[PDB]
Amino acid sequence: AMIRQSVAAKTLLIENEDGKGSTRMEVQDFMKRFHMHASEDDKTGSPSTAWGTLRFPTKEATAPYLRLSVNDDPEDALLFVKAMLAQKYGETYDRPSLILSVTGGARNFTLPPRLETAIAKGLRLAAQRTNAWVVTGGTNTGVMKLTGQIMEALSKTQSHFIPPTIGIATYGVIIGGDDMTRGEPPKIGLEYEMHKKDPPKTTPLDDNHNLFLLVDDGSTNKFGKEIKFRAAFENAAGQAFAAPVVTIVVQGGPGTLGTALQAVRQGTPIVVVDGSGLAADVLAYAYNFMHNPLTRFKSYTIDDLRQKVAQTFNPKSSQQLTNLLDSALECVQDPNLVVVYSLQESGIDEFDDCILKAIFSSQGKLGNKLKQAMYFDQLDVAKRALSEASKNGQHNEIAACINDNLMAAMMHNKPHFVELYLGFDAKIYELKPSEEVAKTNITALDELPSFALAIEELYKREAKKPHSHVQRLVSLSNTDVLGRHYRGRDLANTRAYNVLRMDQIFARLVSKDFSVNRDFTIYDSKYDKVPGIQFRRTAQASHMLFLWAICLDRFRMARHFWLIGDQSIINALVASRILERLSTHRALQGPHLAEERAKMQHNAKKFEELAVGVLGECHGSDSHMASEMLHSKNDMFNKKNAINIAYDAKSLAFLSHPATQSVINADWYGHLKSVTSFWAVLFAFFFPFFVLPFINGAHRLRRKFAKFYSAPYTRFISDLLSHFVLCVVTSYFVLDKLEDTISAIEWILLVWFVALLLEELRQMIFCDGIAEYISDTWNRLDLIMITLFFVGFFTHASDPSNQDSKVVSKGIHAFLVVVLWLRFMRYYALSKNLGPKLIMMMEMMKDVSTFVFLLLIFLIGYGVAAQSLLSPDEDFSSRTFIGVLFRPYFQIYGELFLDDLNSEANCLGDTPFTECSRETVRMVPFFLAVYILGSNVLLVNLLIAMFNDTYMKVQEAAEDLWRKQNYELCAEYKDRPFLPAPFILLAHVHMLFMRLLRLCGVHTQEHEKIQDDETKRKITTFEELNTDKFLRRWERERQEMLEARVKMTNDNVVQAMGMMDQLLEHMISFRFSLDQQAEWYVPPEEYPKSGGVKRYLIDASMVPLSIMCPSYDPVEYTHPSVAAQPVWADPADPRKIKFNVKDEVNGKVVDRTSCHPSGISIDSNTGRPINPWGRTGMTGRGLLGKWGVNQAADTVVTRWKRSPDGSILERDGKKVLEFVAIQRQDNKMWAIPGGFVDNGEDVALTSGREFMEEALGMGSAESKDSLAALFSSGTIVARIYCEDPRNTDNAWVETTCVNFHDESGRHAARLKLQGGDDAEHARWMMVHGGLNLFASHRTLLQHVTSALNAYF
Ligand SMILES: CC(C)CCC[C@@H](C)[C@H]1CC[C@H]2[C@@H]3CC=C4C[C@@H](O)CC[C@]4(C)[C@H]3CC[C@]12C
Ligand SMILES: CC(C)CCC[C@@H](C)[C@H]1CC[C@H]2[C@@H]3CC=C4C[C@@H](O)CC[C@]4(C)[C@H]3CC[C@]12C
Ligand SMILES: CC(C)CCC[C@@H](C)[C@H]1CC[C@H]2[C@@H]3CC=C4C[C@@H](O)CC[C@]4(C)[C@H]3CC[C@]12C
Ligand SMILES: CC(C)CCC[C@@H](C)[C@H]1CC[C@H]2[C@@H]3CC=C4C[C@@H](O)CC[C@]4(C)[C@H]3CC[C@]12C
Ligand SMILES: [Mg+2]
Ligand SMILES: [Mg+2]
């Protein structure tokens, strides 16, 4: 399967530069911006005709390829990739939150299975969770092939969106480039032949990569010519999708080291996979040596690294090895930007956590790190970051980013993060939308708060996804912008997912008269001082999101918002109804939605269970308080109590519960005592003054009197008694003879049936709809009993003295009495014994109909046959038909008319069917014998069997249906007037008088009673406490099941085996461990800052002043900066100046004495000083400002390198130092801070001033006191000669070194290092012997570490 057709694309959606939407443009128009080079000689190039899709063997999908020039814009390539994704997966494609650049070895290599599996699993998890763009080299060898193999399982095991695998490769090495170039673009499904013999090129593309950018420069069979574009694309993609770029380094050669060096220099973090060998092992060794505080790394040395580098890369020259070592040490200088993953240290499936660790150390703002922590589903990491931010005084940034972080957590359906963000003092009703809503002319829309617009954004964002049920539900709803059912356009579409309209849609989903009441006026700032307002604001906000979470069927988030708010049961019933109706709605039908549909139905059942469970818990704890809770009217749903809600939600399970039934029975009896049976209420009803006071003052006796007759049970009793007299009086009237005029009893019955007709009309028009009224069968029976009487009365009243009219009137009134007595069975439904039995009967009527259809066959067959057999010579008449129907129907009830049959057959014998006139009539008994065998033996007994089966089947459902009808009857007799049927006319004239006085007169109103806030908060507190108690009991109960215990035992064993696997791994490591347990300086030729002026070159064996060297001819060159004569520069003529002693220039002493034992010798010919430290191939002062000894002061502010835990880092058994070093502006090499000693100052002042100027720049309070305390203890450790490249034979640098050591490290930690003046960057760097530092500063720190017994 899965091969239908292939059709070429003609138009593409290219995203605009604003980043807001995609515009449709022609493929050749968009694709014009890419160029190709026909040859190496060519520079301008020609427009690219090489783009399309490549089809690779054993791969179902095709991978797009585009050949683009080196001069092409990386933004255009990014647009091409974006356009492809937009074309394939629609406009709303999953944007990448991570760019994973995979670098390493070009040649093939084998990794250990555990490490490869861990790396593959972690990379697959990271890529699938963040929708990451993986950028590799694209060739079918090494780390690119490994990455392709890793991403292949992700492309196979997952449906819909597949994360792109972009391969950026040099076109000049790719097999099949000529085939790809030739043709008319685009080449749809072009076959790629990796085994085809391309002569010059030998590198094929990897078949598992999803896209391909072939960078062309016209060269052939040269590698490495795309690296800069690749870096530029990754940076461009990173800026466009606001995503960090994370490089992953697996194995690798020397160019991978240079690539990694470039990556950290550009701020991009790297993840080094330790244990993969080669350059990765070198990088891992270097970091672990420089940063890791564990005990097993304390034996790490540079000598062993150098040995490792020499044994691994095998350089041709020593300088290459030194440069490689220097580059490797330069990569791991910043500990945050390199994260090393190792199999023997880190755990299995923790590779995505490392990637996340690199991400945290990469992005500086708090919000981006939390968003990324959400994507990888690492709550603990987010919790630790939040706790650390809370402890370190970063509380303001937390509040600034929580809203967006909380919003992001809700869109991606992560409640656990929702709980985290909400726990750190983030108010739920303070959400803010990402975009700004435009102003609307409607006042209802303008009244809406900020959070409402945030939900509107969640609805819009979820709705824009393909084949979303939300869009179909809103479109099918056929409502306007405010949700009213009325069915300009721009306003109706841009804010089509506002919360009011959604509230209206959910209201119609519940029932026909459900209307949720919102009050957004409480969110204004003027009501903040009112007590308890927060809870209300919380509860309302929670409710609105709760409804949103019900719509998207996110059960866990729904349960969380349901728990946060109040009115738990009603909300669970409403939720159950909305899901259940939504699960069978027209908007959710479709082939792809099946699992979704199933999930909603499941969730509906769960919510129903919750509503029952919480109710049960309440009734278990306090029955009276549970009754008070069920009777409470809630303002949000039009003052409807929980039972009204339950009936509207059609929750049979809730209504059949004993707590609910107790409340309904209490409502029936009207909360009075000593009123349970029929006889008690009947006795109290007939004798009001003798039983009521003695049951449990004027306002007591009067209250009890007003309470008893307002009870619905009392109105039933009045209605029964009224209907019973009606039956008795009408029965007497039909039995007694009619008089010659209209009698008095007839007039009484006329008045009584008009009163019943007026009540039926009042119920029909002024109490319910006509459809609702006719639906009920008892209302239909009522209409028949009224029509039959009036037909009967008018038949008699038309001619009262006519005998025939009286006879016809009694004939109609016979049915009237039959219906009346049948209607009297309506009042049996209130009884717990008679009521279900009545519903079962109505169920058994179908079986009665089945029996009637089967008997009808035998009755008409036997009847026609028997009647014909008895009378074979009679003309057909009506009597023949009566003979067919009469006897056969009664013979089934045991009345057999055998004597009558014998008389009709004209058989004169003593034996019944002997000596007859015709022999055929003797067959009359035989037919009947068969007939009564068919009817009484077979059919009646079959009916008994069917009724037995039917009862057992529908008894429980009938009982539940009776419990719903109990409320229905209670609700019906609550609003019905007290006065019975003949007197109801008085009640009717009273209601008409009240309606006339209210509508026209307007002299009155309605009064009611509202429950106090104390009792309201008591009900709220009780309901919340029992909700929590039920959830605790429910969780413990589901954990004590057998299936759960077996599953928990299984997971516990596996995890025990995992720990055992780790234990053996450590043993195998121990087995291995136990098994193995048994100097003249010559300056450079070109003088610095001289504009290319070169010295006179000399060999290193001619450096000593003791050696003669007669061919020494130095060049006299002086720099323009020194020749311009600044304040700190000595005069150009060095005559009359005294050396080897402290000399005064402008009355200030300068250090003109050198520490060299021979001293400075003065040339007699020119007066210039002669350098005692050797020849430099240059006379004159050069770039140095002072003749002879230029006194410099260097400041080495040092501290012990400590881990966070507080332990001192220890290498080679000695403690390791760390000093502030600045990177020089002129030659971009790191160096010790320092400068020339100023006039009138000592090394103490010079050292302090230089340290403040370079490392600190502009500099307080406590930090100034710490710096002064640190600067109060300085020791002059050395006064040596500098090996500075600006030194000449007449001007040389001599340094005094001042060391400021921070033993505790408290004072050093307050310094904000930032490069200024003649320094580019300043940082704390560790002192060691492998440092590639400026001049002879390695000797100076060596002296510092020698003096302070520190590592070197
Ligand atoms: C829905 C049910 C209740 C309908 C009942 C219809 C009743 C009221 C009507 C329908 C047909 C009527 C019968 C039609 C004709 C006659 C013949 C006349 O010489 C005497 C009355 C008699 C016998 C009528 C009695 C009343 C009657 C049975
Ligand atoms: C398989 C079933 C339907 C077979 C039915 C057989 C019927 C058609 C036959 C079988 C025997 C027949 C009867 C045999 C003899 C007599 C006596 C004669 O003076 C009158 C007719 C009468 C009484 C016959 C009536 C028709 C009869 C009942
Ligand atoms: C229908 C199948 C199952 C059985 C058929 C049996 C019928 C054909 C038999 C059973 C008993 C029989 C009757 C028994 C006796 C007599 C008396 C004789 O002087 C005339 C025929 C007459 C009246 C028979 C007519 C046929 C009869 C009705
Ligand atoms: C166990 C049950 C099924 C026993 C069956 C009894 C049958 C065989 C008996 C019961 C009544 C009998 C009938 C009674 C009377 C007459 C009238 C006579 O002039 C001819 C035989 C005839 C028509 C009989 C035929 C056989 C009969 C139908
Ligand atoms: Mg709650
Ligand atoms: Mg009625």
CA–centroid distance, residue 936 to ligand 4 (Å)? 17
**Bond before 1134 cis per omega within 30 degrees:** no
Does 747 sit in the ligand 3 pocket, CB within 6 Å?
Answer: no
Ligand 4 neighbour 927 (Cβ under 6 A): no
Sign of CA dihedral 1026, 1031, 1036, 1037: positive
Is 763 annotated as contributing to ligand binding?
A: yes
Q: Are 1261 and 1284 a contacting pair, CB within 8 Å?
A: no
Q: Which atom of ligand 4 is nearest to the CA of 926?
A: 28
Q: Is the CB of 427 under 6 A from ligand 3?
A: no
| CA 894 to ligand 2 center in whole angstroms | 28
If you measure from the C-alpha of residue 787 to the centroid of ligand 6, how many angstroms do you get, rounded to a whole number?
15
Name the H helices within 90-225: 113-130, 142-157, 177-181
Helix (H) or strand (E) segment spanning residue 239? helix 227-240
- 772 C-alpha to center of ligand 5: Å? 36
3-state SS string over 1058-1095? HHHHHHHHHHHHHHHHHHHHCCCCCCCCECCCCCCCEC
Amino acid at site 352:
D
Question: Measuring CA to CA, which residue among 1246, 1024, 1288 is closest to residue 1150?
Answer: 1246
What three-state secondary structure class fits 1178?
A: strand
CB 983 within 8 A of CB 864: no
Gyration radius from the chain CA atoms: 50
| Residue type at position 673 | K
Looking at the CA of residue 933, tell me the nearest atom of ligand 4.
Answer: 3
DSSP 618-670: HHHH-HHHHHHHHH--BGGGTSB-HHHHHHHTT-HHHHTSHHHHHHHHHHHHT
In the structure encoding, which two tokens stand for residue 1261, read together?
């309070």
Query: Is 1128 labelled as part of a ligand binding site?
Result: yes
- Tell me how far the alpha carbon of residue 928 lies from the centroid of ligand 3, in angstroms: 13
Whether residue 955 contacts residue 943, with contact meaning beta carbons closer than 8 Å, is answered with no
CA dist., res. 395 & res. 1070, Å (int): 47
**Beta strand extents in 329-468 (DSSP E only):** 338-341
CA of 981 relative to ligand 2 center, distance in Å: 66
Tell me whether residue 439 is exposed, middle or buried, using C-beta atoms within 10 angstroms of its C-beta: 0 to 12, 13 to 18, 19 or more.
exposed
Burial (CB count within 10 angstroms: exposed 0-12, middle 13-18, buried 19+), residue 912: middle
Residues near ion ligand 5 (CB < 5 Å) are 563, 568
Cα separation of 1034 and 770, whole Å? 46
Pocket of ligand 1 (CB under 6 A): 784, 788, 808, 811-812, 815
- The answer to whether 243 and 126 are in contact (CB under 8 A) is no
Q: What is the DSSP letter of 1167?
A: -
How far out from the chain centre does Cα 789 lie?
A: 68
**Angstrom distance (rounded) from CA 1147 to CA 516:** 92
Q: Within 13 Å, how many C-alpha atoms sit on residue 1018's CB side?
A: 13
Pocket test of ligand 2: the residue of 870, 907, 913, 919 to mutate, having most ligand atoms within 8 Å of its CB, is 919
- Judge whether 1214 and 300 are in contact, CB under 8 Å: no
Contact call for residues 135 and 259 (beta carbons, < 8 A): no
Residue 1050 annotated as binding site = no
**216 burial class (0-12, 13-18, 19+ CB within 10 angstroms)?**
buried
Q: How far apart are CA 840 and CA 1270, in angstroms?
A: 96
Q: Say whether 1246 sits in a helix, a strand or coil.
A: helix
**What's the first-to-final CA gap in the chain, in angstroms?**
69
Of 646, 566, 1336, residue with least CA distance to 1025: 566
Does 235 show up as a binding residue in the annotation?
Answer: no
Task: Check if the beta carbon of residue 394 is closer than 8 Å to that of residue 429.
Answer: no
267-295 burial, b at 16+ Cβ within 10 Å, e below that, comes to ebbbbbbbbbbbbbbbbbbbbbbbbbbee
What are the angstrom distances between the C-alpha of 172 and each of 144, 198, 226?
18, 12, 11
Q: What is the arrangement of strands in the sheet containing 63-69, beginning at the earlier edge strand?
A: 187-191, 51-55, 63-69, 211-216, 165-170, 133-136, 99-104, 245-250, 270-273, 338-341
- Tell me phi and psi for residue 645, to 5 degrees: -65, -45
Neighbours of ion ligand 6 (CB under 5 A): 779
Query: CA–CA separation, 897 vs 691, rounded Å?
Result: 59
How crowded is residue 701: how many other Cβ atoms within 10 Å of its Cβ? 12
1250 marked as binding residue: yes
Say how many Å lie between the CA of residue 571 and the centre of ligand 5.
9
Q: Please tell me the distance from the alpha carbon of residue 942 to that of residue 613, in angstroms, as a whole number.
A: 43
SS3 content of the chain, % helix, strand, coil (to 5): 55, 10, 35
Asked if residue 760 belongs to a known ligand binding site, the reply is yes
In this structure, how many other beta carbons lie within 10 angstroms of the beta carbon of residue 1126?
A: 8
Query: 782 labelled as ligand-binding?
Result: yes
If DSSP codes are grouped into helix, strand and coil, which group holds residue 481? coil
Type of residue numbered 1027? T
* Assigned token pair, 1349: 């017994």
Instruction: Please give the full DSSP string across 259-319, using - where no structure is assigned.
Output: HHHHHHHTT--EEEETTS-THHHHHHHHHHHHT--SGGGTT--HHHHHHHHHHHH--SSHH
Residue 96: which H helix or E strand, with range? none
Q: How many residues does the chain have?
A: 1352
Nearest CA to ligand 1 atom 22: 808
For this entry, resolution in Å reads 3.0
Pick the atom of ligand 2 nearest to 920's CA: 23
**Cα–Cα distance between 177 and 372 in angstroms, integer?**
40
CB 714 within 8 A of CB 672: no
Phi, psi of 818 (to 5 degrees): -60, -45
Give 386-455 as a 3 state SS string. HHHHHHCCCHHHHHHHHHHHHHHHHHCCCHHHHHHHHHCCCCHHHCCCCCCCCCCCCHHHHCCCHHHHHH
